[PDB]
Amino acid sequence: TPWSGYLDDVSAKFDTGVDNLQTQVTEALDKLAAKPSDPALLAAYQAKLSEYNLYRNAQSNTVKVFKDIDAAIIQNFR
Amino acid sequence: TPWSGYLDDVSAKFDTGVDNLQTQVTEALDKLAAKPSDPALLAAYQAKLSEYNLYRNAQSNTVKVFKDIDAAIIQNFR
Amino acid sequence: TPWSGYLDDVSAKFDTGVDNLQTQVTEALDKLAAKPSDPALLAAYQAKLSEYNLYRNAQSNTVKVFKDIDAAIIQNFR
Amino acid sequence: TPWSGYLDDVSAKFDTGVDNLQTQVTEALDKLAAKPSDPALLAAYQAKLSEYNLYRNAQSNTVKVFKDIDAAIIQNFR
Amino acid sequence: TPWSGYLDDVSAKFDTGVDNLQTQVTEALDKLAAKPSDPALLAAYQAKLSEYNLYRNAQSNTVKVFKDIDAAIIQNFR
Amino acid sequence: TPWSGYLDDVSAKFDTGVDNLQTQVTEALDKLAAKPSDPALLAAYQAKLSEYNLYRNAQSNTVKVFKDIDAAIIQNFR
Amino acid sequence: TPWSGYLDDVSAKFDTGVDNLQTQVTEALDKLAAKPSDPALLAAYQAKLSEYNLYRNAQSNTVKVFKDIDAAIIQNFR
Amino acid sequence: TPWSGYLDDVSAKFDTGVDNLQTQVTEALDKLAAKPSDPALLAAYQAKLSEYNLYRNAQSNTVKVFKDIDAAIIQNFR
Amino acid sequence: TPWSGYLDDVSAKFDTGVDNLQTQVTEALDKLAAKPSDPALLAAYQAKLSEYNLYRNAQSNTVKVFKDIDAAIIQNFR
Amino acid sequence: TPWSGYLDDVSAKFDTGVDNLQTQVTEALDKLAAKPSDPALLAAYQAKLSEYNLYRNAQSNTVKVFKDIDAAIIQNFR
Amino acid sequence: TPWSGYLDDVSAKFDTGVDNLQTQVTEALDKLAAKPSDPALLAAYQAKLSEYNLYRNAQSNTVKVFKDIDAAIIQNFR
Amino acid sequence: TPWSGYLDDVSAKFDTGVDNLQTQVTEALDKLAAKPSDPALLAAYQAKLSEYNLYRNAQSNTVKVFKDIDAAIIQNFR
Amino acid sequence: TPWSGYLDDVSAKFDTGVDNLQTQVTEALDKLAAKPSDPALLAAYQAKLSEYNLYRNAQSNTVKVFKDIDAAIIQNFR
Amino acid sequence: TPWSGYLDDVSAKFDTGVDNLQTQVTEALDKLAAKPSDPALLAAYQAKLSEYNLYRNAQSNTVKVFKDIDAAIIQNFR
Amino acid sequence: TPWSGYLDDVSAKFDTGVDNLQTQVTEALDKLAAKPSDPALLAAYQAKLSEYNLYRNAQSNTVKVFKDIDAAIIQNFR
Amino acid sequence: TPWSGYLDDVSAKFDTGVDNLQTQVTEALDKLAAKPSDPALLAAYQAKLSEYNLYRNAQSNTVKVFKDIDAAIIQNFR
Amino acid sequence: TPWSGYLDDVSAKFDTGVDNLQTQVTEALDKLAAKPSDPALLAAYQAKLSEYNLYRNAQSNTVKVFKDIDAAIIQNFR
Amino acid sequence: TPWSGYLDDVSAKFDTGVDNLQTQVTEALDKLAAKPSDPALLAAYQAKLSEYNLYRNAQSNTVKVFKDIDAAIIQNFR
Amino acid sequence: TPWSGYLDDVSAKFDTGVDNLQTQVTEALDKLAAKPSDPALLAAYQAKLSEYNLYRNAQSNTVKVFKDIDAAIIQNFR
Amino acid sequence: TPWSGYLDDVSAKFDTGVDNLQTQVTEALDKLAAKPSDPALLAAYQAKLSEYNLYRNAQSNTVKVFKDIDAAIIQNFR
């Protein structure tokens, strides 16, 4: 078992929160790439890609906030 | 059960809202393709196709608005 | 019961508005086809066919206007 | 009493501005659907439908302008 | 097997919908060209040519609508 | 009773300020999803969605300003 | 009193402009229908019907022009 | 007399600068709402609404600049 | 004296530029409505209506350009 | 009467300097929370909130400077 | 002096171009109406009426062309 | 083997997704250029060109979204 | 010498390109207005007017393209 | 002589660069307002207005760039 | 004569350096507030406001540097 | 030498194509007018007049086609 | 060798696709201009002119599509 | 030899990439200005102008991207 | 062998990580500069340039983080 | 010879590094100010201004870094 700190556990709450969003984006892109003119495949990929943008931005700002909460405690040791 | 977030649920309100509009367009196109000169088949396909344009544009703008409401909250975490 | 949106309901106001105009055209054509020289059958078919031209053009422009009223609202979501 | 904000009140100035334009369109369409060949019913429906296009486009652009006036104030809080 | 996307499949529903309309126009034109004064050959070619006008215009507008449904989804990715 | 600080109370002034805007958006979307072609349902949903964008952006910037007013006082303790 | 907008008032300038042209056409048709061989009744009905064609075409183009003048102002709000 | 600081006085230079622009927009909207098809009422409301967009954006950027001039002086006290 | 900004003054250059074009259209329509078959009244109304279309479109685009010149200056304050 | 030292008196010069700025922010937020789409309520709240940011930052830096002037005198007793 | 724009001046080049063609048609019709069997009065009225058809059609197409030249410049302001 | 990152692999999913769409456009253009009047060659080229527009726009927006997902992570390193 | 920028110089390439097309249209209209029934004067005016439509549309689109080339450079300064 | 800094001198290079473009726009608008149907006055005003859009946008972006070059030097004093 | 130390003299080099920049901002704001849509008044106020931002930031950083040069000499007395 | 564009050169191919058809019609009409009963003068004038009808209709349709070929290129600049 | 980009090469596929269609139109017009009454010269020129209309419209729309495919890639660089 | 940095060298790759596109646009405009009705001169100028739009937009976005790559390195010096 | 510290080795992990991305950008720009209208050359350059933006921003933030990790250790020596 | 320390010599490496970039910006602005609509003058000024932004920001950060390297040595004398 590799080491995983608190910022890893915050990042793994988002990773285990979504079930297979990293898989559903890649599958719906590969279904879209075979036929990039189907409205049932473009509107399904729009919902996957727009969630994957919002999943990944919220996951990359929650880590940055907890990095800044810790950087004002560690700076107050000395 | 695959994962479905909030933008999927907004997209699935439109998908479960219409009963079989993705089926009625394909059926009325296949009825039209056998005889593309019947006014009862052209005027019926006009109503299906024009709804399928308005169904899909409203479904692809409501996702884009909720993607922009979330992108101004996630940007205000830090 | 199949799904029928608003453009279907506008199209079905014209379809249920006329009682059997899709039937009276086909019957008066089949009466005309047996004897295409009777003035009582040509002048009766002229009134059916000219109404069926005006019925179907008004039914295919009212759908196109309501498709354009909706396409300026849906475009103003974002 | 349900909640109605400022964009609802701008939209309700148009809705209470016209008296029964949502009713006069539906009535003049149902009078037209029984007899879609009367020039007194086609020219009366043309005036109702063309106003209902201009009523609804001006009502759907005034909301979009006030949404853009507010989105440049709210963006200037921070 | 060559690649065929969704707009090709919509275009091939019209092409496989009619059986040999691209052949019946060319055959009835070549029968007409040998004797361009037969009313049984002019009235048969009128029905083929007028269907081939309506077949090809409906096939070239259904592609253009589905190109415009997709161009409002693809524009809403970003 | 759960704990609610000052930023929660600023966020709950917006939440208790609107009566049922989180409900009126979901209801007017579910009314729109059954028939996404009615201009009385698209223009009503435009006013709800555009208010819900302006409600939520002003609620997510007022919290961020009060977080920045406090972060310049807390930084001036030491 | 029912609501009447500007396109109704343009249409009612033509309707109140002619006194009883909608009545004189119907009366001169009912006088013609009893005896459709009188030159004093055919030449009088020709003048009524040809005016009623020019009355109704000018009334249905002046509305369409004012609908297009307004549709280039309303489109320039946003 | 309530308190009004410098950013209020900059905001009140715009408010007392225009005489009754907050009134002329509401009056020209209520005149437009009774008859949303008059070109003399649409082109007059276009000039009021487009000024009210430019009035309010310049008033909401001049406050934000003076908030940023002060935030670089106050930050240079310590 | 009511307030009139720069976009009002651009709109009032067109309004004071034409002397009584808003009056000459209404007078030539009321002269046309009494007798909608005179070629001296149809060709005179064609010249008034076609100028009133070009007057009002140029007046509603010059305001929109000056609204866009100002919206790129006001956006460059901050 | 509770005790109030010099840093309290510097803080109370800002508190008694503004009359009711702690009240005008809370009132203009509660007026904004009932209708968060009015430009007269967003631009008025922007001026209150931006002053309340500059009031409170200048009040929390003037105390910190006088704490540092005193901490270099008290350190020079011994 | 009433206002006369460019389309009026194009229309007045035709009106001042012919000297009294609007008078010569009415005079030669009133001379014809007293005796509608004279070949010197029918052949003179044929030349007046056929010129008045060609005068008025060229005058009503030159205005429509200059309305379309201007409508492609005014549309290219924005 | 040249280097290909993740945005290249997203771009190569579209390139390897379509089999020879870059070839079928060039071949159907060169077949069209020899005889630009065949409806079987214009309607076949319409389906290739409209897919090649939708293929290339979706391929040039999916790269731009993944460039923006990465630019909000890389910006949150520091 | 008045100032003339680059869009003036593009517009003056068309103005100095044609020698006296603004004069030949006005002269051939004034020759046509004296006798609007000569086929040598109608067919000569058709060639002048149709060139003056194509001269002025190409001159009003080349300015609009160069305005759009510059508006994507000026927008890329900041 | 009033004070004029460097951003004024950059703004006065554009103001003294064009000779009387602020005058030529107002003169060509006042010539257009007297007769808004002349193609020689619409195409001349299009070239003035499109230059005045490009003059003013380049003048309002060059100031904003030099404001940002200075704001990264002044921020690097301390 | 009131007392003015060295940091006052550095601050008064900026105050006497600009002639009436504190007056030209207030005058160009009061000219802008009467008509907040003139491009000659918005682009003139942009140059005044952007200089007044750069004047005041450089004046509030030069004082802070000389306060830090002195605070490392005074700290080196003891 | 006056200016002559491409539509003039197409019109001058017809004018220089026929040698003196504008002269032979006028001469054969003046020979016919002295004696309008000679079969050698009526049958010669029939051949001149019927050619002058076909000359002038083909000359006035070839200009209109080339005006429409150019109007679909000029419209595709922007 | 002059420079020729991709839109030139698309335009030169049409130019080198037809062998001498720009020559066959000019030759068949000059053969028609000498004798504009031959049915073997009118029906041959109809086939050349109608192909030259379809050649040039397809050549001027394929360039405009590839200009729009590129304008959505170049816009997605930044 | 004048100085040319890296953004000049990126801009000079586009300038030396095209051979004489700045010359071919000006030559094909001056050939078009002498005769703005030739389809061989309009379709040749369309290909030059549409390339010159795509040349200049790609040249003005590649500079802006490399300005933004450098502005995130220079900002990371301190 | 020149000296290369730890921040050089972190920078050389990115430089040796990509194989020839500094070469593939320059080659795909020089292929694009010869023909800046090919969609196969614009979409290939978009993927190279967008990776080169993300390569260089991640390489210029990882150095800045390791410079800040070291600057909090070196500051804790004394 | 005036005195120039090490930070002057670092600043003079940038000043003598570029040959006449302070001159080429002022010359290309004065060439742009005479004609602010030439794409060859806007795209040339974009490359000068964007380099002058990157020249001056790198010159104003390299001085600030060397000021901070020295301020941690001078602080370690005592």
DSSP string, L7-20: HHHHHHHHHHHSSS
Residues in Cβ contact with K51 at an 8 Å cutoff, skipping those fewer than 6 apart: K21, M36, M37
Cβ separation K55–M36 shorter than 8 A: yes
Residue M61's closest chain K neighbor by CA?
Answer: K76
Cβ separation I6–O38 shorter than 8 A: yes
Point out the residue among Q34, Q53, Q63 whose CB comes nearest to the CB of P69: Q53
- The Cα of R58 is separated from the nearest Cα of chain P by a number of Å equal to 17
Cβ separation I61–G68 shorter than 8 A: no
The size of chain D, in residues, is 78
- The Cα of M74 is separated from the nearest Cα of chain N by a number of Å equal to 6
Q: N35-61 burial string, b = 16+ CB within 10 Å, else e?
A: bbbbbebbbbbbbbbbbbbbbbbbbbb
* Rounded CA separation I47/I64 (Å): 26
Point out the residue among J33, J37, J52 whose CB comes nearest to the CB of F13: J33
Q: Which residues in T lie closer than 8 A to residue R23 (C-beta atoms)?
A: none
- The Cα of G3 is separated from the nearest Cα of chain H by a number of Å equal to 9
- The Cα of T65 is separated from the nearest Cα of chain R by a number of Å equal to 6
Q: Using an 8 Å Cβ cutoff, are T23 and M54 in contact?
A: no
CA dihedral C74, C77, C78, D6 (to 10 degrees): 160
Cβ separation C11–B58 shorter than 8 A: no
The size of chain J, in residues, is 78
| Header resolution in angstroms | 3.6
DSSP E strands, chain E: none
Residues in Cβ contact with A64 at an 8 Å cutoff, skipping those fewer than 6 apart: B77, B78, L76
- The Cα of J61 is separated from the nearest Cα of chain D by a number of Å equal to 20
Chains with 3 or more CB pairs under 8 A to chain F: B, C, D, J
Best residue in I57, I73, I78 for a mutation probing chain H (most H CBs within 10 Å): I78
> Closest by alpha carbon to G55, among D43, C55, D41?
D43
Residue O33's closest chain I neighbor by CA?
Answer: I5
Q: Where are the alpha helices (DSSP H) in T1-78?
A: 6-17, 21-34, 39-70
The size of chain H, in residues, is 78
Q: H38-70 burial string, b = 16+ CB within 10 Å, else e?
A: bbebbbbbbbbbbbbbbbbbbbbbbbbbbbebb
- The Cα of H30 is separated from the nearest Cα of chain G by a number of Å equal to 14
Residue M65's closest chain R neighbor by CA?
Answer: R53
Residue H18's closest chain I neighbor by CA?
Answer: I3
* Rounded CA separation F40/G71 (Å): 20
Residues in Cβ contact with S44 at an 8 Å cutoff, skipping those fewer than 6 apart: L11, S28
E53: its two tokens: 């006008």
Place of tokens 């090809």: E56
Cβ separation H20–I5 shorter than 8 A: no
Touch of E by B (3+ CB pairs closer than 8 Å): yes
> Closest by alpha carbon to O36, among F68, R60, H53, N59?
H53
Residue I2's Cα: distance from chain center in Å? 21
Give the angle subtended at the CA of H5 by the CAs of H3 and H10, to the nearest 5°: 125
Cβ separation A36–E69 shorter than 8 A: no
- The Cα of E2 is separated from the nearest Cα of chain B by a number of Å equal to 23
Q: Using an 8 Å Cβ cutoff, are M14 and R45 in contact?
A: no
Angle between helix T6-17 and T39-70 (nearest 10): 160
Method: cryo-EM
Q: Which residues in E lie closer than 8 A to residue B36 (C-beta atoms)?
A: 14, 17-18, 51, 54-55, 58-59
Query: Which residues does S contribute to its contact with R (CB < 8 Å)?
Result: 29-30, 32-34, 36-37, 42, 49, 52-53, 56-57, 60-61, 63-64
Best residue in R52, R53, R60, R76 for a mutation probing chain S (most S CBs within 10 Å): R76
Cβ separation N62–M75 shorter than 8 A: no
Point out the residue among I5, I73, I76 whose CB comes nearest to the CB of O35: I5
Chains with 3 or more CB pairs under 8 A to chain O: H, I, N
> Closest by alpha carbon to I71, among D68, R35, S78, F3?
D68
Residues in Cβ contact with N14 at an 8 Å cutoff, skipping those fewer than 6 apart: N55, N58, N59, N62, T33, T36
Residue M51's Cα: distance from chain center in Å? 9
DSSP E strands, chain K: none
Residue T35's closest chain M neighbor by CA?
Answer: M5
> Closest by alpha carbon to J58, among H76, O58, F71?
H76
Q: Which residues in P lie closer than 8 A to residue R36 (C-beta atoms)?
A: 5
Q: How many CA atoms lie within 13 A of L7 on its CB side?
A: 26
Residue I3's Cα: distance from chain center in Å? 20
Point out the residue among C6, C66, C73 whose CB comes nearest to the CB of F46: C73
Give the angle subtended at the CA of L71 by the CAs of L65 and L72, to the nearest 5°: 100
Q: Which residues in I lie closer than 8 A to residue H58 (C-beta atoms)?
A: 74, 77
Give the burial class of I61: count Cβ atoms within 10 A of its Cβ; 0-12 exposed, 13-18 middle, 19 or more buried.
buried
S12: its two tokens: 């050389």
Q: Name the residue type at position R29.
A: L
Residue S15's Cα: distance from chain center in Å? 7
Enter the DSSP assignment of I2. Answer: -
Q: Which residues in D lie closer than 8 A to residue G5 (C-beta atoms)?
A: 18, 21, 51, 55
Residue G78's closest chain D neighbor by CA?
Answer: D65
Q: S28-55 burial string, b = 16+ CB within 10 Å, else e?
A: bbebbbbbbbbbebbbbbbbbbbbbbbb
Q: Using an 8 Å Cβ cutoff, are J75 and O75 in contact?
A: no
Cβ separation R43–P73 shorter than 8 A: yes
Best residue in C3, C7, C8, C70 for a mutation probing chain F (most F CBs within 10 Å): C70
Backbone φ and ψ of R24, nearest 5°: -70, -25
Residue H41's Cα: distance from chain center in Å? 22
Best residue in E8, E16, E62 for a mutation probing chain B (most B CBs within 10 Å): E62
Q: How far is CA M46 from CA H55, M32, N12, P60, R34, in A?
A: 50, 11, 50, 8, 19
* Rounded CA separation Q41/E36 (Å): 20
Place of tokens 């090469």: Q9
Residues in Cβ contact with F5 at an 8 Å cutoff, skipping those fewer than 6 apart: none
Q: Using an 8 Å Cβ cutoff, are R41 and Q24 in contact?
A: no
The C-alpha R_g of chain Q, in whole angstroms, comes to 18
Q: How far is CA M3 from CA J73, M14, M65, N23, T64, in A?
A: 69, 18, 21, 10, 46
- The Cα of M21 is separated from the nearest Cα of chain R by a number of Å equal to 11
Which DSSP string do the residues of H3-72 spell out, in sequence order?
---HHHHHHHHHHHHSSSHHHHHHHHHHHHHH-TT-HHHHHHHHHHHHHHHHHHHHHHHHHHHHHHHHTT
Point out the residue among H8, H22, H74 whose CB comes nearest to the CB of J61: H74
Residues in Cβ contact with J16 at an 8 Å cutoff, skipping those fewer than 6 apart: none
* Rounded CA separation A30/G14 (Å): 62
The C-alpha R_g of chain L, in whole angstroms, comes to 18
G71: its two tokens: 């549709």
Q: Using an 8 Å Cβ cutoff, are R64 and P33 in contact?
A: no
> Closest by alpha carbon to R4, among T19, T12, N69, T28?
T19
Residues in Cβ contact with M30 at an 8 Å cutoff, skipping those fewer than 6 apart: K13, K17
* Rounded CA separation M58/P7 (Å): 15
Q: Using an 8 Å Cβ cutoff, are R62 and S49 in contact?
A: yes
* Rounded CA separation Q65/E71 (Å): 13
Point out the residue among H36, H49, H64 whose CB comes nearest to the CB of D55: H36
Q: Using an 8 Å Cβ cutoff, are S54 and L74 in contact?
A: yes
Q: Where are the alpha helices (DSSP H) in P1-78?
A: 6-17, 21-34, 39-70
- F28 C-beta neighbours (distance < 10 Å), count: 19
Query: Which residues does H contribute to its contact with I (CB < 8 Å)?
Result: 18-21, 24, 39-40, 43-44, 46-48, 50-51, 53-55, 57-58, 61-62, 64-65, 68
> Closest by alpha carbon to K63, among K20, K19, K4?
K4
Q: How far is CA M17 from CA K66, R33, T39, in A?
A: 21, 5, 22
- The Cα of H57 is separated from the nearest Cα of chain D by a number of Å equal to 7
The size of chain T, in residues, is 78
Q: Which residues in S lie closer than 8 A to residue L55 (C-beta atoms)?
A: none
Cβ separation M33–K17 shorter than 8 A: yes
Residue D64's closest chain J neighbor by CA?
Answer: J37
Cβ separation B74–A64 shorter than 8 A: no
Chains with 3 or more CB pairs under 8 A to chain I: G, H, K, N, O
Backbone φ and ψ of D21, nearest 5°: -70, -30
Sign of torsion over alpha carbons K46, K48, K54, K60: negative
Q: Name the residue type at position G51.
A: E
- The Cα of J42 is separated from the nearest Cα of chain H by a number of Å equal to 9
The C-alpha R_g of chain M, in whole angstroms, comes to 18
Q: How many CB pairs under 8 A join E and L?
A: 59
> Closest by alpha carbon to O32, among O49, O15, O12, O18?
O49
